[PDB]
Design a protein around this nucleic acid. Structure first.
Length: 74
DNA sequence: ACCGAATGACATGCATGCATACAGGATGTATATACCTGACACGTGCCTGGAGACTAGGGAGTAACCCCCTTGGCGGTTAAAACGCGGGGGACAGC
């Protein structure tokens, strides 16, 4: 029951509205605990952020690459 | 509000990532084989030093006593141990 990775990621940030930006783990724990994702879930989430930040709609407030915190950037 | 055109959602086609098992094939290792001899094993001296027997005289082992200092006990106070806890920052994991 997993649609395209665009949707839960933005939903997860909406769940915990950190103004400083959500740290990489905060999304990772919730979406796997809440929904059901494939055996290689964590790998897909990391590059999901990586491609998502390249699209520019999300802002990494702290850290470099995937290791930091990210923000919806409205 | 259903009918079309259009479009988002749903369902799957397509391509890919990734894992995995293999089989190869290469290399290193173990086997498998002769010869080889420095080198352990006697072997033969050869003597000196360990044993026998000797005396002598002190140090260890006894008894004997003692007293102190160890152990025991015996309240009183109170300083320190025990407990609760609120939390923050140190460990730690991940990229």
């Amino acid at each position: 029951d997993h649609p395209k990775y665009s949707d839960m990621i933005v939903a997860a940030i909406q769940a915990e509205k950190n103004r400083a930006g959500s740290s990489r783990q905060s999304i990772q724990k919730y979406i796997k605990s809440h929904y059901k994702v494939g055996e290689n879930a964590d790998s897909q989430i990391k590059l999901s952020i990586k491609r998502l930040v390249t699209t520019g709609v999300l802002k990494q407030t702290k850290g470099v690459g995937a290791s930091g915190s990210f923000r919806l950037a409205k």
